[PDB]
């Protein structure tokens, strides 16, 4: 399933350029309300996917011993991932945190080899190193890069974790269902302690934007986990890294983001890497 990687990439790119549009059209909105309402809205989409694909529910497969990996990955990538990424946005810029979130596959390509004993010794390493070089050639810095690598470690380790559970008796739709359930619970606990207001979600326009963003993000995650299931964690993240090309394209086309010559070079480098990987 090689095209599923690129499909996950394009759909996360659409989701991200919808999120940018949302946060640009609304000022008072905060990422904690957005993530919570996104997850609460997407839980329905996941129930729909599960009910349509196979039988109603299978809760005997949600064993407590094995799926600790998926819950720890969800609470390690969802809540604190977004928190530290917004911290990086407030610290060192709105577009460098996303660049590091795209250079994330380094920690994944390390862990999948060392921890999961995967065999990617020389094939994928070159494409991923070239993508990394392009992202670093695109660009207080010692703390900004520290928080950025803290985000990247988590977002690259959720993949290694999610490929640990799905080795035996956990399909793509359930291993993601528990992920979204636990991320929603975590964001609920976080909001409840801070008493964050929910008045903004009642808007119909915001609800429409949130449902299209949740649909895009969820198709992205579903294709990405179908890839990981049958293409592992070593390349299934490298193939998905292509979403930066898309994100930049849709930002310079639709949202009217200014185009510079350096971003064209970085996009050419990363597309060269993605083409090298196959």
């Amino acid at each position, epitope marked *: 399933g090689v095209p599923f990687g690129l499909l996950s990439g394009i759909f996360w790119g659409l989701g991200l350029t919808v999120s940018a549009y949302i946060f640009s059209i609304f000022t008072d909105l905060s990422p904690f309300v957005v993530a919570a309402t996104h997850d609460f809205l997407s839980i329905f989409i996941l129930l729909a996917f599960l009910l349509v694909k196979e039988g109603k529910v299978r809760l005997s497969i949600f064993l407590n011993i094995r799926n600790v990996s998926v819950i720890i990955g969800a609470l390690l990538a969802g809540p604190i991932g977004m928190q530290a990424n917004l911290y990086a946005v407030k610290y060192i810029g709105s577009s460098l945190a996303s660049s590091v979130s795209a250079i994330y596959p380094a920690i994944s390509v390390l862990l999948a080899f060392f921890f999961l004993k995967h*065999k990617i010794s020389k*094939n994928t390493v070159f494409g991923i190193v070239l993508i990394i070089g392009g992202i670093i050639a695109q660009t207080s810095f010692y703390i900004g890069i520290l928080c950025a690598l803290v985000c990247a470690i988590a977002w690259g380790s959720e993949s290694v974790l999610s490929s640990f559970a799905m080795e035996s008796e956990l399909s793509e739709i359930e291993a993601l269902l528990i992920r979204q359930v636990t991320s929603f619970l975590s964001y609920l606990v976080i909001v409840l302690f801070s008493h964050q207001s929910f008045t903004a979600v009642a808007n119909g326009q915001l609800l429409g934007l949130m449902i299209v963003f949740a649909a895009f993000d969820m198709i992205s995650y579903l294709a990405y986990y179908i890839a990981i299931n049958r293409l592992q964690p070593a390349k299934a993240t490298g193939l998905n890294v292509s979403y930066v090309v898309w994100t930049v394209l849709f930002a310079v086309v639709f949202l009217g983001a200014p185009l510079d010559m350096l971003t064209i070079m970085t996009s050419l480098v990363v597309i060269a890497g993605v083409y090298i990987i196959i």
Partner: nanobody
Amino acid sequence: QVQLVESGGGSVQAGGSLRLSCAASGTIHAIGYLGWFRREGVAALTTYDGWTYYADSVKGRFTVSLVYLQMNSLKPEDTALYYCAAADDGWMFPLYHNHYEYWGQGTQVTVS
């Protein structure tokens, strides 16, 4: 993709030495790591560079050449079917019977 044939197996008295041979046939141009198992990792050579990784239990007693496995100082614990193996792509992770996709039939070696 590649057919592996082993030769040289048999019965050997403990305290001597023995040589085992592996011949590969087919698309043999892009195979990086060659191996020798008994499925534990006992030997693995790199083709281009020419390094050989061994098992700590036999490191210094068995030797690899380019595939020939020369086993010295035999012990009755070495009675096993030895298998050949190859790897499409490899840099630093030998001795694992999940990296190597091309597998042979193996020949029996019995130490007395």
